[PDB]
């Protein structure tokens, strides 16, 4: 949170045990930007030599 | 009487002496889809999409030009079609151009629709894909050869109907062009309907052009004028 000094010592003592994720959301654990671009699989089929279309 | 006793899928029916194989599917509500075969012109081999098996007997055979003795048992369903079926779409897919966005039959190209309700749902050969060069020939008919399947059914239609005999197919193994190779102007009465037998995109209409789209047309029944044959 903000610089906060015995008003988090009132919201302390008031809904007891606080400051874990502060309700707002708005610090760090933004995951940045896909740091590596994704790239997919494939599942099954996409496969020669397997398969005709009539067993799947 | 001059009548025999055939099954399909274990269900009789009483055909004529003679009559073919795709035409006793017919009887019974089976279409055995096809190309190069068409009800008025004369039968080639040349698709290759009407193979069908026959039960006891090893080979495939082709529904198109196949007489129908006493006591075939045709089995449409059985997986040696299917896989028959699956392997024909797959060799015509080999070799054709992605024109659908741009050709002119997208909603109605028998590619499209015997593509999805028989063929594989995945192609594959990376390396490949010939192309043709591409003839102009009437002002009526636009002609992108590239998306020709090679199906003889033009050929067959002008020389037998039409009668001008004037086009044919030249070349062999990937390379066989289909048209005039001489360049020459091909036009006659009768000649436009050329652009409704060829199951592709590659014959299409000059003048109606990229215009409109058959699934977005509303039809309605009408008759002639301009000739007396109603
Ligand atoms: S000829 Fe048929 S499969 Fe080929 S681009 Fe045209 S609509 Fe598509
Ligand atoms: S031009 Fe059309 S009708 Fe003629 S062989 Fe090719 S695909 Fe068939
Ligand atoms: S109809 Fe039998 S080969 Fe085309």
Redesign the pocket.
């Given at each position: 949170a903000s610089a906060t000094r015995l008003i988090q010592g009132l919201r302390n003592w008031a809904s007891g045990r606080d400051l874990q994720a502060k309700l707002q959301l708005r610090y760090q654990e933004i995951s940045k930007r896909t740091q590596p671009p994704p790239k997919l699989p494939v599942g099954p089929s996409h496969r020669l030599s397997n398969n005709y279309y009539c067993a799947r | 009487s001059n009548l025999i006793e055939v099954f399909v899928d274990g269900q009789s029916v009483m055909v004529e002496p003679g009559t073919t194989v795709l035409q006793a599917c017919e009887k019974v509500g089976m279409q055995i889809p096809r190309?190069?075969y068409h009800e008025r012109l004369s039968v080639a081999g040349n698709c290759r999409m009407c193979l069908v098996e026959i039960e006891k007997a090893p080979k495939v055979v082709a529904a198109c030009a196949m007489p129908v003795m006493k006591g075939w048992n045709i089995l449409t369903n059985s997986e040696k079609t299917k896989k028959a079926r699956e392997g024909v779409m797959e060799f015509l897919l080999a070799n054709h151009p992605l024109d659908c966005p741009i050709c002119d039959q997208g909603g109605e190209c028998d590619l499209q629709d015997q593509s999805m309700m028989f063929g594989s749902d995945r192609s594959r050969f990376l390396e490949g894909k010939r192309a043709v060069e591409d003839k102009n020939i009437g002002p009526l008919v636009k002609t992108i050869?590239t998306?020709?399947?090679?199906?003889?059914?033009?050929?067959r239609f002008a020389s037998e109907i039409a009668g001008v005999d004037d086009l044919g197919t030249t070349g062999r193994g990937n390379d066989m062009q289909?048209?005039t190779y001489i360049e020459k102007m091909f036009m006659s009465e009768l000649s436009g309907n050329?652009i409704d037998?060829?199951?592709?995109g590659?014959?299409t209409s000059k003048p109606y052009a990229f215009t409109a789209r058959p699934w977005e047309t509303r039809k309605t029944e009408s008759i002639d004028v301009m000739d007396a044959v109603g």
């Open positions: - | 190309f190069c050869m998306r020709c399947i090679q199906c003889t059914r033009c050929i289909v048209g050329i037998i060829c199951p592709v590659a014959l």
